[PDB]
Design a protein around this ligand. Structure first.
Ligand SMILES: OC[C@H]1O[C@H](O[C@H]2[C@H](O)[C@@H](O)[C@@H](O)O[C@@H]2CO)[C@H](O)[C@@H](O)[C@@H]1O
Ligand SMILES: OC[C@H]1O[C@H](O[C@H]2[C@H](O)[C@@H](O)[C@@H](O)O[C@@H]2CO)[C@H](O)[C@@H](O)[C@@H]1O
Ligand SMILES: OC[C@H]1O[C@H](O)[C@H](O)[C@@H](O)[C@@H]1O
Ligand SMILES: OC[C@H]1O[C@H](O)[C@H](O)[C@@H](O)[C@@H]1O
Ligand SMILES: OC[C@H]1O[C@H](O)[C@H](O)[C@@H](O)[C@@H]1O
Ligand SMILES: OC[C@H]1O[C@H](O)[C@H](O)[C@@H](O)[C@@H]1O
Ligand SMILES: [Ca+2]
Ligand SMILES: [Ca+2]
Ligand SMILES: [Ca+2]
Ligand SMILES: [Ca+2]
Ligand SMILES: [K+]
Ligand SMILES: [K+]
Ligand SMILES: [K+]
Ligand SMILES: [K+]
Ligand SMILES: [K+]
Ligand SMILES: [K+]
Ligand SMILES: [Zn+2]
Ligand SMILES: [Zn+2]
Ligand SMILES: [Zn+2]
Ligand SMILES: [Zn+2]
Lengths: 547, 375, 547, 375
């Protein structure tokens, strides 16, 4: 905007130059019978406007004086006044105003498309934003807190809009209809308000983070396409890690056929062994679809070594999962788990452990404003002997789930020092504290930020197949010996049935190929893992054998 | 104004030009016997002060040199010093004091007339302003809160004054004596303070919004022309909509409005149950089933099953929307009447499953509006 | 500071001018054999430095070119660079910095003398400051709150210093030793800290405002020269006004001889009558030393009309005060006073009324964190029927003493409307609310700001005789018939005894002359009122009759 | 730096002068057969670019006019545009970003070495800084509080960094690996967090101030080189001074220090009474006579009469001074030992009537000081 105005002025200056120069030659002729070249004209005009004033070329008539006077003043006005002033107004003012005074972005440009709207900022969404700035996605966070808008503007991995998140006018300004996705991370009532409002304008996909698992249904009603119960999930990931021996934990039931479960390896016979060595698939018929270690989901090799902290992601039938449970295959007696901190997450960890059930003891300073179903031992875990009196002595494991990382680090320190034996699972509110929890003696650390970010992140990237795979199903099929040697693109599987190949594992191998390329040459005995509508799965074995 | 001082300077600059041009000709003639035209003198004076300096016309006598030096310096002082120093100190100064540091308005111009003072801005009075915009009244909102004056400045269909509403000196700078009308929408004690203070200056008509219907008489006594008990009226609208035996009405929210709806249902009478998470600081004539309702089964406990009606009257619109969702979810047909604190939530309450929605801001703005028009 | 530097530069410019001009004439001569006048030199030099460059006088030698080049550049540097830059640094920067950014005054100039230090800002001291800015006294308020320092700096009836009030280093910076007076209006512990610290540096007089009358002694110990129990005093002024009929209230006992008391006129036989008509002095022998009405203490005339709201200031012997009490002279039966608000002031009003005693009832929302001696009826006076249930019906008077003026205005309104008979005394936290309390129906309004300011103000102005009259005594003496016709300056009373004439009243008149001028001619039967040490009062009737 | 860019510009300006002067002579000769000296060319080029314009030397050919025009414009661009635009954008910009808007330091220079990091600034650590000033160490105080960093900026004998003490990236920018020593004066949990974080980067010696003596072992475990239990030590100093039957000691204040003094007196043992206005959030092994003492007769009630000693241990110096006054007033000779949180109140406690004063900041600074010197 400003640049155009600038060298638009430069153009007007040039025209003034040529004009004055042309008039100069004209006057010198018709007024004093003197003839100057075009160059002399430019030369003189520049000499005057610029106030050099050599004086080698001057007029002698009053009319010439009147003209020279006019050009002279023109130079001062357009080179000594307008020019600097305009620079102070077009450049200087806008700079100092927008650097000493926050001017809130209240609206988004009309041409904004495919952007991601973030409502409700916190560690989770902050980490999500930094993570997807590593891909340069257009993020726009919204907030109705002036002070927060400022803080978010000084440092920016994203644009910040300041306005009421639940005002349809404000949502129209954000271009919600043209937006790619929407993260609803406000309170549950505000989320419900947000979803209904957004839905009155568009069908833009919405991912809501629910603070209380019971409200999940309500948010789907208000218009949310996906609901993520973070605290429930977080409590669960603390829980599955607290037992003395890892146990199967169910994840998904794809229409009562394919089951997805996860298994922490600690204290199991699989610890220390390799995937091939443990022979999990041979003895259970299960598919190992991934190994989660060091915050990275890798593909299962046969030489891969399972560590105490490894976590297997598994897929198969109900009986195949029951086989694995038998192999583990039993829990030690008198298991007792202390849970320090009875907030939403600690509360969820308790609920998960009760689903089994494993005996536990909750400990917190004050009564829960949201929970009534749990009996809590009241006291300050930091104040001497509060844990001793609660009988921390016969505990087999501890979950430290305070909302303060330094306190969790201190408790992990003390517990590991007084009980070098028990499992210690700790929670990190921020990732800048994860390593210290390990250094303090924790057997595993669950990070709010990374778990939250990974989930939301994946829900985002796989959006083009999120609402798709939503309502649909994942199933497994023994590759028909008829296609033994044919390429995925050659079989033309999708155009017939409608499903999609998401994995191909060898007959006698823990080695699996995830998201195989069309060029992949199929083999004999191979086991396919497909995904599609609960209609195409039945129209699969039908359409495939037909044509 | 900065325009007058500016062109008044151009005036002085012009006089200086003519003065110097004339003195020029005079010296050229009397000192050196040289005759120059008027244009020549203007041309020379401009040439010197503008520092161009063609040199085609110079003196040769000492007195001429002196004069030439004086004009040169004049051009530097009045064109290269005062002009810019003026520029910056004249209007680049106001810029900082009004754009780098928020400067609240603490007084209206002397001749401000026919304006409507608003005391206590909120959804109702905000809806009032944007409603009578076509009538093009000058609305002035008054507030003793700095941060609020600041926020009311950025976006506007109304002027914002910052000061104590109950201070006589502040009201005089607001020109209350010349105002069209005054809307008192503060606490009842504050309203009373405001009325008596205003009445000591003038008899500008005052429309007071009163919280407790009993206080209506006192506000009149203080000097209010009209008293509007909105919470009673809004409560009545809720109670009316929730009815038109074994009829049983759940009222979620025991604030003033919810309380008024209960009071209304007694007159019928229609059995009802009040539900809140706190005790009423102003009410003690109603029985309230305490315990937060957003949790989940607090309504199930109370028995949202055998009820015939539900009134949602929290002072938070999103909470109202959530409760409406939950209710419509638990019971697909029970009559639900929801309260909307702001008109921007009216549509989401209906979308949530409400059968009727009472809009505080709409009913408020309308009543106050027809009270200003019919005056 | 800046101006000097400015026209110091102007001087250096002039010297440069004369120098270059002198060198010019020199070079033109010894280099080109040309002779120019002094004026031509100045003219040329100005022509170059200023960049006009007529060209009518130029050099032709390389050395001349080198010189012209040097002068030319000198002009650009000292007129086009330094000059504006210096203006931006000496003027522009200091202005924008100290107008967009608060720079705290941390110290006072070394030569600061006779100033008044204010510690602890509030309505009282704010009003005190505005009041004594009407006399242009040098006030300096001190505070350790950054945010408060800013607010006090934007608008200023005084300089503001930001620092710890109880730090001797900070006190030395304030020049406490050279200061006139010090107002200690902090908490009692902070005041005690302040006094001890100030006392370790100087003997500068200190006036402390105590928040709890019991701490008064402690503050005199720490070094305070004067202690003002504002809340006690305020409670008293509410109390003396609440009774159905005004009653004598003791103020000072000057060594068991001269007594000072005050009497509100409401409900007494003196109401409506004039001072002469009531014949108070004739019937009691008392001296009427002042009439306090409409916030102004005037001298008692005989034609002066006493109104319901008038307050007599009286002086005389114990029996003379007892005579007046008899004239009034009795209180109505079943007096019952409701006191709304049990803060420090309301509490003090109760204590005063108990000193008589008059039956009362305290009413407040919560228990007092400081009082234990009073039984309080708990409830919200604003919530319907709280006063009704307390039996406001049989009250003879009400004192409304909430810490919120609007609430006091509302209560005054309602009470006067439901009980048009009872006395209503109300308290104003700020003077901007006094008139409205009257308009609401209050019989009298006690203003914190004005009472506080008047007291402190007087303690200040009369400082030169404050600590003097402190410890001293005020006494009355029947003018000896020996000086019947002599002038105050002629009698030479002070040089003999040491006392001072503060009043002279006629034998048969309520007319009194306060602070009589030395020229005043004394009469016969006149009654003198003097002040001095409890040593000079005895050395009075002795020294006067002797010589 | 702004000096290099500046004189580097003067360098380019100089080259332009010589280039134009040489081109000048070349054109004058080849275009018009006129011969000019080197000084003449410099003199002409300066005369044109500086816009003086004497005119004593002008071209007469078109190509000369063109060249003359080019130099004129060069002087305007490089002397009347870039020079000032530079000025303002070069160093009048930094001025605003560092004087109109506080800019906290979030990172120390790469080569910072031998510095002492302070975490948790307070009277003790503040007294430490002003004490070892003659040794001329570079002390850096770290704080995650903006408003505190701002205040610590105006007055200084030490540099202030703003950031999370327990963030590894923040500690790396603080150059912990190259620091002389680290003083951890935060909460015990925070200290533990700080130690482990620091230990993952380096083995810089750490001196931790610990609140609860039991936590000393854990801080060591985290990685602290030395653990200083000040509250235990200060409490012991109080108890020691208050003694060296029917001996009875009043301890006013049951904070950690007051609590430590009580614990100390048990070992003697010497009978004592704790007096506070609240219950101890960290202690439950002592009986405390509750009820505020500043009111008046709370000490009289308890029996300040038959007592043989008084320890004043509130965490507020003025309150301590007041209590000392009141005590010395009620009893002219009973032994009084007062605690001073800051060294600026030590003298007023003695003036108030204390028999001995333990100075938290002095004892603190001394211990930590001799711990840094002897290292
Ligand atoms: O400098 C001019 C001068 O002119 C007058 O003096 C003489 C002048 O010197 C002669 O050249 C001639 O013009 O006649 C003049 C007198 O008639 C003025 O008197 C004098 O003021 C003035 O300076
Ligand atoms: O404009 C100068 C010109 O000089 C040369 O041309 C001629 C010139 O016209 C004659 O006046 C004389 O000086 O001899 C010159 C040739 O020997 C250059 O050739 C030409 O480049 C230059 O423009
Ligand atoms: O420069 C002005 C010119 O005007 C005309 O075109 C003349 O023919 C020409 O001689 C002259 O040079
Ligand atoms: O992810 C699996 C989830 O399945 C069910 O929803 C369970 O209620 C829940 O405990 C579990 O977390
Ligand atoms: O201006 C320079 C002067 O120098 C000497 O003083 C000469 O005597 C004089 O002729 C000349 O005018
Ligand atoms: O001013 C007179 C005062 O004398 C005494 O100090 C009384 O205790 C007090 O009630 C009264 O206010
Ligand atoms: Ca850390
Ligand atoms: Ca809405
Ligand atoms: Ca008022
Ligand atoms: Ca002190
Ligand atoms: K020029
Ligand atoms: K010339
Ligand atoms: K020029
Ligand atoms: K010139
Ligand atoms: K010239
Ligand atoms: K010439
Ligand atoms: Zn729970
Ligand atoms: Zn009610
Ligand atoms: Zn009391
Ligand atoms: Zn203890």
């Amino acid at each position: 905007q400003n640049l155009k105005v600038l060298l638009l002025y430069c153009a007007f200056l040039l025209v003034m130059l040529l004009a004055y120069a042309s008039i100069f030659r004209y006057l010198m002729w018709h007024l004093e019978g003197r003839a100057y070249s075009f160059m002399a004209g430019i030369y003189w005009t520049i000499t005057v406007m610029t106030t050099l004033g050599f004086g080698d070329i001057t007029f002698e008539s009053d009319a010439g004086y009147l003209f020279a006077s006019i050009v002279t003043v023109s130079g001062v006005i357009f080179l000594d006044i307008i020019l600097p002033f305009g620079f102070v107004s077009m450049f200087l003012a806008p700079w100092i105003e927008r650097r000493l005074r926050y001017h809130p972005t209240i609206e988004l440009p009309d041409d904004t498309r495919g952007h991601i709207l973030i409502f409700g900022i916190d560690p989770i969404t902050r980490t999500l934003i930094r993570k997807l700035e590593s891909r340069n996605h257009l993020f726009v966070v919204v907030t109705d807190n002036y002070d927060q808008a400022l803080h978010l503007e000084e440092q920016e991995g994203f644009k910040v809009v300041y306005g009421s998140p639940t005002d349809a006018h404000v949502l129209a300004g954000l271009r919600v209809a043209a937006a790619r996705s929407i993260i609803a991370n406000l309170s549950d009532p505000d989320n419900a308000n947000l979803c209904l409002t957004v839905r009155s304008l568009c069908q833009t996909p919405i991912i809501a983070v629910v603070k209380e698992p019971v409200h999940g249904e309500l948010l789907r009603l208000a218009g949310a396409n996906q609901v993520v119960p973070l605290t429930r999930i977080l409590g669960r990931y603390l829980g599955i890690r607290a037992t003395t021996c890892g146990a199967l934990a169910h994840i998904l039931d794809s229409f009562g056929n394919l089951q997805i479960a996860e298994l922490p390896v600690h204290g199991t016979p699989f610890a220390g062994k390799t995937i091939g060595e443990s022979g999990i698939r041979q003895r259970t018929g299960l598919s190992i679809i991934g190994v989660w270690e060091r915050g990275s989901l890798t593909t299962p090799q046969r030489e891969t070594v399972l560590t105490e902290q490894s976590l297997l992601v598994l897929a198969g039938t109900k009986s195949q999962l029951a086989a694995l449970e038998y192999l583990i295959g039993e829990a030690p007696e008198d298991e007792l788990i202390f849970i320090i901190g009875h907030g939403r997450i600690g509360c969820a960890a308790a609920a998960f452990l009760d689903r089994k059930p494993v005996p536990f003891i909750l400990i917190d300073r004050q009564e829960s404003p949201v929970c009534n179903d749990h009996v809590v031992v009241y006291g300050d875990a930091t104040v001497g002997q509060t844990l001793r009196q609660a009988g921390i002595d016969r505990a087999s494991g501890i979950i430290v789930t305070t909302n303060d990382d330094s306190t969790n680090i201190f408790l992990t320190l003390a517990c590991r020092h007084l009980h070098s034996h028990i499992r210690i699972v700790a929670r990190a509110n921020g990732e800048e504290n994860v390593d210290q929890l390990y250094a303090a003696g924790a057997d595993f650390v669950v990070s709010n930020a990374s778990v939250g970010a990974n989930i939301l992140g994946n829900l985002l990237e796989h959006k083009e197949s999120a609402f798709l795979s939503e309502g649909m199903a994942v199933f497994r099929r023994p590759l028909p010996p008829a296609m033994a040697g044919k390429t995925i693109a050659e079989t033309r599987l999708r155009p017939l049935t409608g499903c999609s190949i998401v994995a191909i594992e060898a007959p006698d191998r823990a080695d699996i190929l995830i998201s195989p390329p069309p060029e992949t040459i199929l083999a004999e005995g191979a086991r396919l893992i497909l995904i599609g509508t609960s209609e195409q799965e039945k129209t699969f074995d039908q359409t495939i054998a037909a044509r």
